[PDB]
Design a protein around this ligand. Structure first.
Ligand code: CLR
Ligand code: CLR
Ligand code: CLR
Ligand code: A1H3L
Ligand code: OLA
Ligand code: OLA
Ligand code: OLA
Ligand code: OLA
Ligand code: OLA
Ligand code: OLA
Ligand code: OLA
Ligand code: OLA
Ligand code: OLA
Ligand code: OLA
Ligand code: OLA
Ligand code: OLA
Ligand code: OLA
Ligand code: OLA
Ligand code: OLA
Ligand code: OLA
Ligand code: OLA
Ligand code: NA
Length: 389
């Protein structure tokens, strides 16, 4: 069948994806710019990620359409329009890794996050990552390319001029670059590192919630021990274990609650050491008033904060997993082309399906934010209502 027919479908789908990638990710950037509740270090990487996806729509998709025609081009110019998308994919990987690491720092050392992770440091990292993405993605332009061995018969058949080639991705970009350097080293290894970071994030969150409940049970258990003690020495032991636990849970109404708690433990401890068991047990019953009015609120707020961090980490992980889902088919196909030269090449329709799938990843993140992050969803609603209605 005439090639322009299947090419028309491919091109129309690409243009549709490009429109959606621009619109959705412009909306992401507008929301962050407008809403100070969204202006944090994590979302600066989200904006860098949205900028890469905007450029997929504006530049990479037009470049992919161009390079599908096989038009006559100087080989190194053809190389640039083949490789620019690799810059954008690489920048996306760096942003996704940064988001994972940022969330790990927030859950693992929340006390030093704000001093460690600042807007100025994020902006420098983003700048550095974009420079490295150009170096990685344009590495073929530094000589790791097939321009030294042009397909002259294909070029001559298309009427190309001297020094020109038919501009086709797999004719100019070496397959060993795409598989060993781009895929294995620059894509697969960072994604696996991300998986490891996310595993540590979720394991750290689970441990911290288990520790919260352990401290709650230990507090209530030791209260029971004091109640059914029969001498002053048993009361002292439990109060001593309670006091060390109270300080462990301590590191304004929160501070007041723990100030009461430790003080009421010291009061009961002093009576215990005078051998006044009954009087000490009565002092320890006061702890329950402090536990109800203060400690349960501290426990519940800490649990709710920790669960929100789990929720934000799952949302970030969904973004990283969707990047992998959308890009792996094209990379896997390249692996078959490279590692199985006895295999027939994947057919052209599947090539174009794998290409458009990789491009759909630039559409999907705005939907994940809308469905999973209320602050985005509310800002999206207000932008659309005012500025599109
Ligand atoms: C700021 C943005 C919008 C600038 C966009 C510049 C783009 C469109 C330019 C910059 C470099 C250009 C390429 C440089 C060299 C050649 C070789 C020639 O034989 C065919 C055109 C081709 C392949 C050009 C296509 C267009 C190109 C990719
Ligand atoms: C990330 C998830 C969705 C995995 C994706 C699996 C895809 C990319 C795999 C599964 C089956 C694979 C195909 C199985 C057999 C062949 C025949 C060979 O002559 C060319 C490659 C080709 C056509 C493979 C291309 C890649 C392929 C389509
Ligand atoms: C965590 C996961 C996604 C890692 C990625 C898996 C990749 C590296 C694996 C999965 C399936 C594999 C392919 C399965 C079958 C063949 C056919 C053989 O003749 C050459 C190797 C080749 C082409 C493999 C190359 C590597 C491959 C593409
Ligand atoms: C991820 C990088 N990447 C690739 O790895 C990649 N590989 C590839 N292969 N395309 C064809 C193969 C054979 C053909 O005919 C025989 C053909 O005819 C038009 C096209 N396009 C790719 N793109 C899109 C620009 C991309 O972006
Ligand atoms: C949506 C994009 C529609 C415009 C595409 C026109 C047909 C594609 C082509 O030029 O072959
Ligand atoms: C071209 C693509 C880049 C657009 C992104 C520029 C950053 C705009 C948003 C800044 C912010 O949210 O604070
Ligand atoms: C040429 C392509 C360069 C990319 C510039 C896009 C980076 C802007 C987004 C990051 C800024 C920010 O998040 O504060
Ligand atoms: C929109 C951004 C710029 C447009 C995107 C791709 C430019 C297309 C380049 C086409 C090269 C034609 C050269 C030729 O006719 O031989
Ligand atoms: C809209 C922005 C540009 C859209 C698609 C880029 C079109 C360039 C592809 C034509 C290649 C030139 C040729 O076929 O000789
Ligand atoms: C910003 C808008 C400027 C870029 C617009 C797209 C130009 C598309 C290139 C057309 C290629 C024509 C090739 C030819 O005439 O043989
Ligand atoms: C922004 C820069 C965009 C592209 C960067 C420079 C490309 C310069 C010309 C490349 C085409 C060379 C073709 C050749 O010599 O074979
Ligand atoms: C060649 C290297 C190109 C330079 C890359 C462009 C720099 C990235 C802009 C980052 C925005 C700062 C926040
Ligand atoms: C940063 C890395 C820049 C990589 C090379 C950019 C284009 C140079 C090749 C060329 O101009 O033809
Ligand atoms: C910084 C260093 C980047 C390397 C400079 C670009 C080399 C261009 C390759 C070439 O045109 O042949
Ligand atoms: C090949 C790695 C696949 C995992 C993608 C990144 C990890 C996402 C974690 C959940
Ligand atoms: C390769 C790994 C793909 C994992 C996808 C992550 C979740 C997708 C939608 C939930
Ligand atoms: C990640 C590791 C992925 C698997 C590497 C697979 C290498 C297959 C080699 C093909 C054997 C051959 O060429 O005959
Ligand atoms: C680790 C993965 C390394 C992959 C190397 C296997 C390919 C070597 C070969 O083609 O014989
Ligand atoms: C998703 C919808 C269906 C996707 C079909 C994608 C790949 C199917 C697996 C093989 C299809 C290509 C046949 C292999 C060949 O002809 O060499
Ligand atoms: C994801 C959205 C689904 C897109 C559907 C198919 C787009 C590419 C299919 C190409 C049609 C046949 C082209 C060919 O004959 O080689
Ligand atoms: C779901 C995605 C659609 C599958 C791709 C559509 C093309 C089917 C195979 C084309 C062909 O048989 O030539
Ligand atoms: Na992207």
């Amino acid at each position: 069948a005439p090639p322009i027919m299947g090419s028309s479908v491919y091109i129309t789908v690409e243009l549709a994806i490009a429109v959606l990638a621009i619109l959705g990710n412009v909306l992401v950037c507008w929301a962050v710019w407008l809403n100070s509740n969204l202006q944090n270090v994590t979302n600066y990487f989200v904006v860098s990620l949205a900028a890469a996806d905007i450029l997929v729509g504006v530049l990479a998709i037009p470049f992919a359409i161009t390079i599908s025609t096989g038009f006559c081009a100087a080989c190194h110019g053809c190389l640039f329009i083949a490789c620019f998308v690799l810059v954008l994919a690489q920048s996306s990987i760096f942003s996704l890794l940064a988001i994972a690491i940022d969330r790990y720092i927030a859950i693992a050392i929340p006390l030093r996050y704000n001093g460690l992770v600042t807007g100025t440091r994020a902006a420098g990292i983003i700048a550095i990552c974009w420079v490295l993405s150009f170096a990685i993605g344009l590495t073929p332009m530094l000589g790791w390319n097939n321009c030294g061995q042009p397909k002259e018969g294909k070029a001559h058949s298309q009427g190309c001029g001297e020094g020109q080639v038919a501009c086709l991705f797999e004719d100019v970009v070496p397959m060993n670059y795409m598989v060993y350097f781009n895929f294995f080293a620059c894509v697969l290894v960072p994604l696996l590192l991300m998986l490891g970071v996310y595993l540590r994030i979720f394991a750290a969150a689970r441990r911290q919630l288990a520790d919260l409940e352990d401290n709650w049970e230990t507090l209530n258990d030791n209260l029971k021990v004091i109640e059914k003690a029969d001498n002053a020495a048993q009361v002292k032991d439990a109060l001593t274990k309670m006091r060390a636990a109270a300080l462990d849970a301590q590191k304004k109404d929160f501070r007041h609650g723990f100030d009461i708690l430790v003080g009421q433990i010291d009061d009961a401890l002093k009576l215990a050491n005078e051998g006044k068991v009954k009087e000490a047990q009565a002092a320890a019953e006061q702890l329950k008033t402090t536990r109800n009015a203060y400690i349960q609120k501290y426990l519940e707020r800490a649990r709710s904060t920790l669960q929100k961090e789990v929720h934000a980490a799952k949302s970030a992980a969904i973004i990283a997993g969707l990047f992998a889902l959308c890009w792996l088919p094209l990379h896997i196909i390249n692996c078959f082309t490279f590692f199985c030269p006895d295999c027939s090449h994947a057919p052209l329709w599947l090539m174009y399906l794998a290409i458009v799938l990789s491009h759909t990843n630039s559409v999907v993140n705005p939907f994940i934010y809308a469905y999973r992050i209320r602050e985005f969803r509310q800002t999206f609603r207000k932008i659309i209502r005012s500025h599109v209605l």
